[PDB]
Amino acid sequence: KQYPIINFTTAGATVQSYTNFIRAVRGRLTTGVRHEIPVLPNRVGLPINQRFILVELSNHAELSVTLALDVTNAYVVGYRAGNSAYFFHPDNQEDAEAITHLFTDVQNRYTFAFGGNYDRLEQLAGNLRENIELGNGPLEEAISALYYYSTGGTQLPTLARSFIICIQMISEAARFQYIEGEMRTRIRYNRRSAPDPSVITLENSWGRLSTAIQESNQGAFASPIQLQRRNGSKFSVYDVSILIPIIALMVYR
Ligand SMILES: CC1(C)Cc2cc(C(=O)O)sc2-c2ccccc21
Ligand SMILES: [Cl-]
Numbered sequence: 450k451q452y453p454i455i456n457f458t459t460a461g462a463t464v465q466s467y468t469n470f471i472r473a474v475r476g477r478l479t480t481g482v483r484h485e486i487p488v489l490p491n492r493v494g495l496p497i498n499q500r501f502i503l504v505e506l507s508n509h510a511e512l513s514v515t516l517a518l519d520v521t522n523a524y525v526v527g528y529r530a531g532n533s534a535y536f537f538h539p540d541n542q543e544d545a546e547a548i549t550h551l552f553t554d555v556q557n558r559y560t561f562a563f564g565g566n567y568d569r570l571e572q573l574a575g576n577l578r579e580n581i582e583l584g585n586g587p588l589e590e591a592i593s594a595l596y597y598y599s600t601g602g603t604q605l606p607t608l609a610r611s612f613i614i615c616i617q618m619i620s621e622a623a624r625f626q627y628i629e630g631e632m633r634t635r636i637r638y639n640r641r642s643a644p645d646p647s648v649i650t651l652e653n654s655w656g657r658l659s660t661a662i663q664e665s666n667q668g669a670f671a672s673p674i675q676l677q678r679r680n681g682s683k684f685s686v687y688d689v690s691i692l693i694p695i696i697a698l699m700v701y702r
Contacts, residue, residue, distance in 0.1 A: 452517075452551065453477045453502045459589040460509040464636050467585075471632075474623045475697060477502045478523055485693060486662060491701045492521040497550050501526070504619060508589040512596045516615065517551045522700045523620050525565060525612070526551075530599035533557035537565035565612070567652070573609035578617070578649050583632065584641035587614045617644065621652050627695045628652075650677040651695075659699040662689050 455477065457470040481490040481499060490499075505515040515529045517536075526548060527536035534552035538561055539545040552558070563569050571577050581587075591611035597603040603611075622629040628648055635642060644652075651658075654674060661670045665688070673685040686692060 450498060451503075452498075454515075455502065455504045456507075457504070458507040459585050459592065460507065460511075462585050462636060464633050467636055468629070468633060471619075471622045471629050474502075474504065474518075474619065478518075478520055478623060478698060481520075484663075485689065486696060486699055488663065489523060489698050489700050490520055495521060497547055500547055501551055503551075506588075506592050506615075508592040510589075510593060512593050514592055514595040515552075516619065517548075518620070523623055523698055525616055525620060528595060529555060530596045533559065533599045535598070536560045538563055540564070565616075567613070567616075570609045570613050570616075573605060574613060575606050576610060578613060578652075579643050579646070581610055581613050582641040582643055583614060583617055584635040585639075586641050588618055591615050617648075617652070621648075621655075624655055624698050625651055625695060626697050645679045646677045646681045647679040655696075656700065658692065658696055660702055662692070662696075662699060663702045665689055 455470065455473050457467070475487075478489065479487045481495075482488075500520060502518050502520060503515050504518055505513060507513045516525050517527045517529075518524065519526050526544075527534060529535075529552045532555055534555045534557070536548050536559070539548060563573065567578065574581070591614045594603045594607050594611040595615070598608050617628070618632050622632050628651065631644070631648060654676065657674050661672075661674055664671065668689045670687050673687045675683050675685045677683050
């Protein structure tokens with residue numbers, strides 16, 4: 450029994466082909482409703498045969514990697530390249546026991562010393578999110594860099610930067626329609642550009658926005674959380690109705 454697999458390729462990717470890809474990622478993630486915003490499945494009690502989904506990516510050089518996405522928080526937990534599989538360091542032993550059920554066929558299994566969170570990947574990559582280009586070009590380059598890590602051809606700083614690109618255009622593009630729209634604009638005009646402060650702010654606030662929405666009374670927040678306009682200037686929202694077209698998935702709380 451294999452997990453659900455989603456196929457996307459950067460070779461000739463259009464605005465529509467990438468939209469259908471992200472729309473497919475949201476579908477497999479929200480299989481397990483009534484809420485106006487879909488709520489990701491609960492970690493406790495979730496049987497392992499529905500704990501993950503696989504997102505395989507290819508590029509113009511026909512190089513392929515498969516990313517493993519947890520379904521409770523839509524985060525990449527590891528990836529397989531050829532005959533090897535790589536996993537971030539798990540948070541507890543329950544998650545360490547869950548990851549031995551993916552890629553049960555590879556010959557080489559490795560667990561990194563570090564977690565997959567952004568601030569760690571930015572230290573490893575030697576660059577911040579505001580300095581890492583996003584787009585189809587940066588994604589095609591990442592895919593080649595993920596695989597060639599299995600052959601010793603990619604060093605760790607390039608691998609960490611490649612994770613930052615992939616996590617933003619798959620995981621963050623699923624969570625927020627706003628971020629997916631930002632990626633679709635880069636594909637539309639064939640331009641690579643780093644995320645503006647309105648995007649980093651949403652990525653860091655996903656857990657905090659997931660808090661205020663499920664804990665909202667009639668849709669009103671208890672305390673206002675603050676977002677950023679694209680010019681860096683800040684504001685504050687107080688209810689769910691302004692974020693409905695903005696956020697698509699929420700971790701359970
Ligand atoms: C932060 C985010 C997602 C992005 C954004 C960027 C704006 C600008 O270009 O000034 S406004 C605005 C906005 C408004 C209402 C809810 C959410 C947002
Ligand atoms: Cl570490």
